[PDB]
Every structure is written in C-alpha cells, then in structure tokens.
Amino acid sequence: QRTGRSALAVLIRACYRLQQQLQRTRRALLHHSDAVLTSLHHVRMLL
Amino acid sequence: QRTGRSALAVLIRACYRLQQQLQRTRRALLHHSDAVLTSLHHVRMLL
Amino acid sequence: MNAHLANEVQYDLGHPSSLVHVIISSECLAAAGIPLAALMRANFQVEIQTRAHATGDCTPWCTAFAAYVPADAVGELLAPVVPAHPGLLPRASSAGGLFVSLPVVCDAQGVYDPYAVAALRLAWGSGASCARVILFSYDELVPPNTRYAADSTRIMRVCRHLCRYVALLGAAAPPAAKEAAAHLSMGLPPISPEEQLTAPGGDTTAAQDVSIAQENEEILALVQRRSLVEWLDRGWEALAGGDRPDWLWSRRSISVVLRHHYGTKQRFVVVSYENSVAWGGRRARPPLLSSAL
Amino acid sequence: EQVVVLQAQRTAAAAALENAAMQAAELPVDIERRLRPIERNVH
Amino acid sequence: EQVVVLQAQRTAAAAALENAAMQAAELPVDIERRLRPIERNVHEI
C-alpha cells in the first residue's frame, strides 16, 4: 500500500511546482521587460 | 512485462526532451537579446 | 507600382550590385525641402548615384524612374483599384509618396558597406534652384528581415471581396467572374495598410514559430499515447478585362517593411515582392545582401 | 561647420531609436510563445 | 553658442542610453539565472 502511493508523491510534488515555476517566469520577465520599453520611451522624451 | 516497461517509455520520451526544449530557449533568447544590445550601442555610435 | 516595374528591367539587363525598392512618404519629402505640388503636375526621370566611404570617388549619375502618387502610397500596393469598378477593394487612407528603387553596391560574397551613401536627386523643373538631393546610407536602406508572413492575411481578404462584389453585382456580372466567385467561396473589414506596417512579426520570427510548434505538438501527442491563386486571376481578367502587370504583383506576396530616415526623422517604406529580381524577392540572384560589416 | 554636423548627428540617431523601438517591442512577445507551450505541456 | 547648447544635449542623451544599456545588459544575466535551476529540476525527473 505505502510503496505505490508514496512513490507517486515524488511525481506529485514535481508536477504541481513546475506549473508554478513557469508562472513566475511569465511575471518576472514582463515586470523586467517593460522597464526596457519604459527606458526607450524615455529617451525619445529627451529628444 | 510489456505493460509496465512500455508505459514508462511514454514518460521517458517526455522528460529527456523537456531537458532539450529549455536549452534552445537559453540559446535562442540570448542570440536574439544580444541584437538588442547591439542595436542600442549602435545608436550611441551615431551620437 | 509602375515605377518599380520599369526599374527592374534596368537591373535585369545589368545597369555585381543589388537593388532596394523604396517608398518615400509625403512628409519625408516635405522635410527634405521640396514642394509637393510641383510633383503633382506617369513615369518620372530621377538621377541616382552612389557614393563611397571616406574616399570621395563615386558612381556617375544614372537615370532611373519614379512615380509620385497623391493617394495612399502603401495601399496602392496592397489594394489596387479598377477604374471600371471602384468599390472592389475597400481600403483605409494613408499618405502618398513617390516610388524609387535604389541601387546598393556589393562585393563578391556580397557584404554592403555601411556609412556610404546612395543619393537621390528630384528635379521638378529647369535650373539647379528647382532640385534637391536626398541621401540614403546603407544603414538606412536595408532592414534585417522581410515580413512576408504579414501578407498571409491579405490575399485571404481579396478572396472575400471578390466573392462579396460579384454577389453584390448580381446578374449583370460577366460569366467568367460568376464562376470564380463561387469557387473562391468554397475555398474559405477593409484592407488596412497601417496594420501590416505595425504588425509585430517578421519572417525569421515566423520561421521560429514553426519549430516551436512542431516540437511541441509531438510531446503533447505523447501525453495521450486550379489553385486559389489561379481563380483570383480570372476575377480580375473578367471584372477589368486585362492582365495589367501592375496588378499581377499585387495578387502575390508583398513584404512591406517600415523604416525611418536619418536626415529628417520621417518614415519611408522598403518593399520587396515575390516575382522580383531585386532585394528581398524570392527570385533573387546570388550573392545576397548581408550585414556582416 | 560644426553645428551642421552636430545637428545632423542628433537627428540621425533619433531615427535609429524608432528602428530599435520596433525591434525591442518583441521582447514582451518573444517570452510569451516560448513558455506557454511548455506550461500546458506540464499541465 | 549653438555648439555649447547642442553639446549639452549630446552628453545628456548619452546618459539615458547608458541608463538604457545597463538596464538591458542585465537581461542576459537573468536568462542564465532563471532557467538554469529549472533545467536542474527537470533533470531530477
């Protein structure tokens, strides 16, 4: 009973967190990349 | 014999290729992003 | 359109180098210092030479061809107008400038030199007082990539507007266009030229959209486990009544790349066709242009 | 002579920003279509 | 006097580009900061 039910919990903790790791890379690469477009629009404001 | 050994080969082909898909996103997002830094340094050369 | 046709005949017959088809905007001409109404008064001779990098020596003046359109400039490419049936292709408005192809000096294993200049000269009268010189660096002429993928939604619209117009025309249709309107309907908003200029996608960004797609469809399959171009040609030959080689290239793929002018900050458009010997065309002659320098 | 150079250089790179602004406008695009066919792959 | 005014703008524009350069030079650090542990996680499987 405890052999098959706990060995799958290895792959439970892996799959539900890889769903979470790619969500931060959606956010942290858009809250960083918009600063680039913030900087480039600022340079045109100087001109 | 063929039931358990071939059902894991589904998850064999999935895991060794997800190791490969993220390697191209390391390369193709650095051979693209360095062109942005190439462009911005070129604009300062005009000034 | 005719100004790009009548230039590639000069380039086909050898007069190694390259050729870049350019649409100047109206406001790029205005800030360059020419009067726009003087050009309105349909080909037009324009002398063009190329200058080197830090040498002084230059190509002598060669006469090339031009045509200024007070109209939509880019929309004249994408949605041409039959004089008989004016409401065939509805389109949006845009600015209107001249069409001039520009020569690009190459090498063997063709790598163009930046910071050298290809030069125009617009002459609208007699005397040097009625002439200005517009300059183009090789940084200015050549973008990295074409955008033929942005053209894919346009021909699929012209397929619809023929099916809409012939059904609008009814029984007074020519019988050839009656057939082609039915067959295009089995094969299945105005044409806005400003949407292709601002669409965020090139060719190499679209070629990468295949390799990201095919390799992701495979693993997601592992989790579980007379063409239409020909029928368009018989629509125009029935509704208008002729070939009109202006209109031959409008039915095929056209990449419309937006650029900016270094002298006067205004925009201009670099255009490449499918049946074009010049740069960006799918029938091009080696060696091609490369930005190695 | 220097003003005619110094002005033409400033108007030059003003155009090169808008070539780069349309070039750098794909960075919020280029991240999206690389992560999303891997998220549904895991999900 | 036109030289002094425009050279004040040339050095002012160079600061905003270097603000923009050092902002976007940190992006290749992040791709080799965010994806490398995620590659290690898939190797655990």
Asked if D touches A (at least 3 Cβ pairs < 8 angstroms), the answer reads yes
How many residue contacts between B and C have a Cβ separation below 8 Å?
15
- Residue-wise over B5-43: b if at least 16 C-beta within 10 A, else e? eeeeeeeeebeebbeebbeebeeebeeebeebbebbeeb
Q: Are C104 and C19 in contact (CB under 8 A)?
A: yes
Token duo for residue C276:
């074009």
- Cβ partners under 8 Å of residue C34, min gap 6: C122, C124, C132
| Residue in chain D lying closest to A40 (CA) | D21
The DSSP output letter for D31 is T
Q: Are C147 and C253 in contact (CB under 8 A)?
A: no
- β-pairing, C267-272 vs C122-123, is unpaired
Q: How far apart are CA B10 and CA E28, in angstroms?
A: 34
Token duo for residue C160:
């619809």
Q: How far apart are CA C235 and CA C241, in angstroms?
A: 9
Q: How far apart are CA C75 and CA C96, in angstroms?
A: 9
SS3 call for C137: strand
Half-sphere exposure of C128 (CA within 13 A, CB side): 0
SS (H, E, C) C94-114: CCCCEEEEEEEECCCCCECCC
SS3 call for C50: strand
> Token pair 């066919």 is at which residue?
D37
CB contact (8 A) between residue B25 and residue E32: no
State CA C18 to chain mean position distance.
16
CB contact (8 A) between residue D10 and residue E7: no
- From residue D32, alpha-carbon distances to B29, C208, C212 in Å are 12, 13, 12
Q: Are B37 and A40 in contact (CB under 8 A)?
A: no
Q: How far apart are CA C275 and CA C277, in angstroms?
A: 7
State CA C166 to chain mean position distance.
28
Half-sphere exposure of C234 (CA within 13 A, CB side): 16
The DSSP output letter for C149 is G
CB contact (8 A) between residue E13 and residue A32: no
- Cβ partners under 8 Å of residue C272, min gap 6: C21, C146, C254, C255, C257, C278, C279, C280, C281
SS3 call for C132: strand
- β-partners of residue C131 are C123
Which residues does chain C have within 8 Å of residue B46's beta carbon, measured at their own beta carbons?
262
- β-partners of residue D14 are none
CB contact (8 A) between residue C219 and residue D25: no
- β-partners of residue C98 are C68
CA distance D9 to chain B (A): 6
Torsion of CA B5, B7, B9, B15, to 10 degrees: -130
Q: Which of E6, E27, E33, E42 to mutate to test the interface with A (most CBs of A within 10 A)?
A: E27
Q: Are C113 and C105 in contact (CB under 8 A)?
A: yes
C254: left (phi over 0), alpha (psi -120 to 50) or beta: beta
CB contact (8 A) between residue D23 and residue B44: no
Token duo for residue C103:
């020569």
- Number of Cβ within 10 Å of residue A20's Cβ equals 9
A14 and chain D: CB distance < 8 Å anywhere?
Answer: no
- Number of Cβ within 10 Å of residue C119's Cβ equals 17
Torsion of CA C279, C280, C281, C286, to 10 degrees: 60
Q: What was the experiment behind these coordinates? A: cryo-EM
Listing DSSP states for C265-282 in one string gives --EEEEEE-SS-SSTT-S
Q: How far apart are CA A27 and CA A9, in angstroms?
A: 28
CB contact (8 A) between residue C205 and residue D38: no
Which chains does E contact via 3+ CB–CB distances below 8 A?
Answer: A, B, D
SS3 call for C16: coil
- What single-letter amino acid sits at C273? Y
- From residue C243, alpha-carbon distances to C4, C180, D16 in Å are 17, 16, 41
- What single-letter amino acid sits at E22? M
Q: How far apart are CA C272 and CA C254, in angstroms?
A: 6
Q: Which of B18, B36, B43 sits opposite D17 (nearest CB)?
A: B43
Q: Are C18 and C103 in contact (CB under 8 A)?
A: yes
Q: Are C5 and C246 in contact (CB under 8 A)?
A: yes
Q: Are C32 and C265 in contact (CB under 8 A)?
A: no
Q: Which residues does a gap of C–N over 2.5 Å follow in chain A?
A: none
The DSSP output letter for C288 is P
Listing DSSP states for B7-38 in one string gives HHHHHHHHHHHHHHHHHHHHHTTTTTHHHHHH
Q: Are E14 and B41 in contact (CB under 8 A)?
A: no
Q: Which of E19, E23, E44 sits opposite A14 (nearest CB)?
A: E44
Q: How far apart are CA C287 and CA C265, in angstroms?
A: 31
> Token pair 């062109």 is at which residue?
B35
Q: What is the resolution of this structure in A?
A: 4.2
- From residue A27, alpha-carbon distances to A21, B27, B42, E42 in Å are 10, 21, 30, 21
Torsion of CA C247, C7, C122, C197, to 10 degrees: 50
Q: How far apart are CA C43 and CA C6, in angstroms?
A: 9
Entry field: residues in chain E: 45
Q: Which of A22, A24, A35 sits opposite E23 (nearest CB)?
A: A35
- What single-letter amino acid sits at C85? H
- β-pairing, C135-137 vs C131-132, is unpaired
CA distance C223 to chain B (A): 7
